[PDB]
């Protein structure tokens, strides 16, 4: 079983831990976090977004017992002090965010870990991966620090990939309607629509390089707790109807992007996609086409759960290629 | 002074009443509503969206005393029973919504009112007006039932008019991010992003006829109390930069669309536009241009206050043309 | 297996159906609702509060296939037209609310059902039951129309019962802080704290008659989607400490009120009690005692899930006593 | 005119500045804040809670021009470096919160200010003042550092004072239902009811010393933007009815507590008290009495605006006693 450590216990770290503890192919050996075992067990068991954890979560002496398995707990702010060599850590998931991600990852390597998965794109990682888009690019012999991009990029890239490979993309603009996770952001008070910048369209370069200059956009932060939406207005290179666009997505969801992209013909609201494991769910009832070429596509994503499921999928892909190069 | 009655005391009726009671050029003679004077005075004085009313509001015997002036109160469900002939009502504002608006308006005419302003587009009105766009079309000798369109159309039409007259519009799609005012709408529970249909782009035909087939869109209802946003992605017929688009809006706001359209270079959030009297406020900091032609424009509007101010402006325009044909 | 029908498919009807379809001791033969099978299947599968249903939900010809079992669907507004005699319906759960509940129940009896469970107290039912408080009072030979009280009464009555039997209650006042489910209620706009009346303290008379005149209170509706709170300030007849009060609750939760009342020493928030099946969960960390006698107790309850679980428990209790009088 | 400086530009500092700039008896000479003049002018002009500022707000070179008057701007983190002696500052309002308030105040004294008003109780101030309760205690010759208590204490103390002086208070418990401004607080996500501690009942000792041991309580943080509520359950020393309690409050509001406490017989919601200048508004329709002695009283307060108005009232009281000892 691949041996994994998790650094940082924010929402992504906790969701990844929840999902990995259910994977019997993965052994979560250790956690490095800022809090005591009792606080960590509380945070694992209870969650205001995804509900209570199904398995038994129990705090012990500098460890957790989760689903019957022991997980060691550490509290090191300098990652190169961690006992990763002594624990034979195969993969560290670096879940403390964007800030100095590459330095932290190198710290984990210096501590004896073999590979690091970053949770942010464009940190000078050896390779940027979006599952369903370019995971084939991972070389276990050449790639040591691997990025899983971001949640919005994990939604945007498969959608855009389907569109470009079926119809060709001329150019497009997008709005990502973002749940909660710049004077505008600082004056929020959790009550307003807030326009901000987004980096998902630029991060698209890392996984679909032939497409930069073609897409850009902004974010609208809205006061919903979780679940976000990509609103993409894109011009295609060939004539389409809404039904043809939806059929391309429907076919990708059942084949090449199975488990990553899904397609829905149901009249759902954003809350219905809470704890959905897909990277993107096309809302088939809203697809629009103006003058056969200008296409509006709406894609739902749980900006926490889908990304964490992709992180676990990536752990499994990397581990398989580590044992069988 | 032009003599006005208001039918219906929902949020639009109450906001229009608040604004008209401040206009010394307008005499609000009467109100027809479903509640007693005490309840109406409560609803006039207090408002969870726009705050407490500034003037003294007092309930009397089947009347209100507001800002020192008496307003008669009626409770007729059939508008042709109203004493509009006996009160010399010049204009009735029909504020009970879209349902059977033309029948209600004819009822007010049969009761003796001279003109009716509907608060919804496409009700077979004699003319559809958006102030700043086509108010010149009103003929006091030929037009008896007049529509002020809708709040979203009052935002979209001036923006689109500036764009078309300065640069020409090829085609475009829009999202209106709507505050609160179909299985999706029924399953809301006030907590989700809800995609729905919108009729603002189609209602554009009534005030800018040369532009239909060129624009369509959808709505995203989000749980904010008030203030909404038009997110327009439009292709233009000539090369532009973001600065040139913003300068066109800035020039229209200070001249041809003064008081109707405004332009902001400040980093504001949606709540900062609460009780803003403009039909649309361009957010200059978010304007984007892809490949010199594909333009993203964001326009804020208080979907209640701006529309009600336009209703009062229209009352004044119609009354001026009634006295001086 | 006891044969059950459900009348009305609001949130309580749907939650009860979800829970009963999992109970292999209960056969849900039929549903009477206002919508078609496709809409009902949508509403069963998806829920903005409690998430997606775990089992396969599928719509057929005037029926549903849920978890592999067929459920017949009817659309009768007059309950005495229903084929309950032909289906051998043992128990009808009347889930259309308070309005004319007894008339509806009699209609179900006239249609051939043997017993009816109302979802509201004080409707001239033969007996009012709160599980854990007085279910022993049900007589299968004398009681035909049975009430499960209300969600707030199902929280308040076990708490008050523990307090009265351990320490004696002199008098008390309560506030129920209520999630969303009178000029104040009509002016809401989903954004305010709204004081209203509550009938839970009066409904206490029906299940704990020796206690009326001793308790009354009000409600504060707050804009949270689900999960509510009883804030009880009660004077006791003997000296206590906070620890003794909490120990009384802790002992009741593990014995006489097992499955109905629970006790928590964890620092949780309201959202952590979403889809909790208990009628009440004492928040042990907030219990307060002033001058040894005046006690503040806080009790969480999911105002939907706990009540629906109690409805299913009551179905099982009634059915057991029907087969073994 | 009394010369005032404001230290700290959080919400209380900004609201106090807004109110003081309207007072022609007060000269706001300077502000010490963490941001540039342009950012400060933005924050003064726009506010997501209380709306846009009425007066002209303009940023100049290390100054603001507000309502036509110039206000100097400083950016000193050490208050004893401020030029208060050179500006003849009479009163500094210390609006950076509870943390090290007395040290900051002494710093302002060392810089040359004559008096300091703290915005938190129990900081070893020379005197704690609640306007309407004990402002008579201020001695301009003996008191140099003055506390205006807290917003919740400014609501609780006048209510409790009326009750104790009219009927006598035996003991009581309270809940303060608090808008947004401990594992529970850290796991919020702005969506839950959160029980926390409150210090308002203990701070009552400072302004009504004969009453400690008699009152204590907790807070329930609820996701409303502004406006909070005190829910007080108190036993009195003499028999009362709800009408007598409400009449005591009504008489205090029109006499001894004019401008501080108000009384409402209207069915309002919390949002209707936004930007209300009173310290407390009794909700007369919810007052309850159990067994002639146990009284429930609900008191609304804008936890920002009322407190800031009290701060300005205190500035005026202190200045009057400074010039006329």
Curated annotation (Swiss-Prot), chains A, B, C, D:
D-glyceraldehyde 3-phosphate binds at residues 150-152, 181, 185, 198-199, 221. Keywords: Cytoplasm, Gluconeogenesis, NAD, NADP, Nucleotide-binding, Oxidoreductase. GO terms for cellular component: cytoplasm. Its main location: cytoplasm. InterPro entries: GlycerAld/Erythrose_P_DH, GlycerAld_3-P_DH_AS, GlycerAld_3-P_DH_cat, GlycerAld_3-P_DH_NAD(P)-bd, Glyceraldehyde-3-P_DH_1, NAD(P)-bd_dom_sf. It is found in: Cytoplasm. NADP(+) binds at residues 11-12, 77, 119, 303. It holds the Pfam family Gp_dh_C. This is Glyceraldehyde-3-phosphate dehydrogenase 2. It comes from Bacillus subtilis (strain 168). The gene is gapB.
């Amino acid at each position: 079983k691949v041996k994994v450590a998790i650094n940082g216990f924010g929402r992504i770290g906790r969701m990844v831990f929840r999902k990995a503890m259910l994977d019997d192919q993965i052994q979560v050996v250790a956690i490095n976090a800022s809090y005591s075992a009792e606080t960590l067990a509380h945070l694992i068991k209870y969650d205001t977004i995804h509900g209570r954890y199904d398995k038994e979560v129990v705090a012990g002496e500098d460890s957790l017992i989760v689903n019957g398995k022991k997980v060691l707990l550490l509290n090191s702010r300098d990652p190169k002090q961690l006992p990763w060599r002594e624990y034979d850590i195969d993969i560290v998931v670096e879940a403390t965010g964007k800030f100095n991600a590459k330095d932290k990852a190198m710290g984990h390597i210096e501590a004896g870990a073999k590979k690091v998965i970053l949770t942010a794109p464009g940190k000078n990682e050896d390779v940027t991966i979006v599952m369903g888009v370019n995971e084939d690019q991972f070389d276990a012999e050449r790639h040591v620090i691997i990025s899983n991009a971001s949640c919005t990029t994990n939604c945007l890239a498969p959608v855009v990939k389907v569109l470009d490979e079926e119809f060709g993309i001329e150019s497009g603009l997008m709005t990502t309607v973002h749940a909660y996770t710049d004077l505008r952001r600082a004056r929020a008070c959790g009550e307003s629509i807030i326009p901000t910048t987004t980096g998902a369209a630029k991060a698209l370069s890392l996984v679909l390089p032939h497409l930069k200059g073609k897409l850009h956009g902004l974010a609208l932060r809205v006061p919903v707790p979780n679940v976000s939406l990509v609103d993409l207005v894109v011009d295609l290179k060939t004539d389409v109807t809404a039904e043809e666009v939806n059929e391309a997505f429907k076919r990708a969801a059942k084949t090449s992007m199975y488990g990553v992209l899904d397609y829905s013909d149901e009249p759902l609201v954003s809350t219905d996609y809470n704890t959905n494991p897909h990277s993107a769910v096309i809302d088939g009832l809203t697809t629009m086409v103006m003058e056969d070429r200008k296409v509006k596509v709406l894609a739902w994503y749980d900006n926490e759960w889908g990304y964490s499921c992709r992180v676990v999928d990536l752990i499994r892909h990397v581990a398989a290629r580590m044992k069988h190069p």
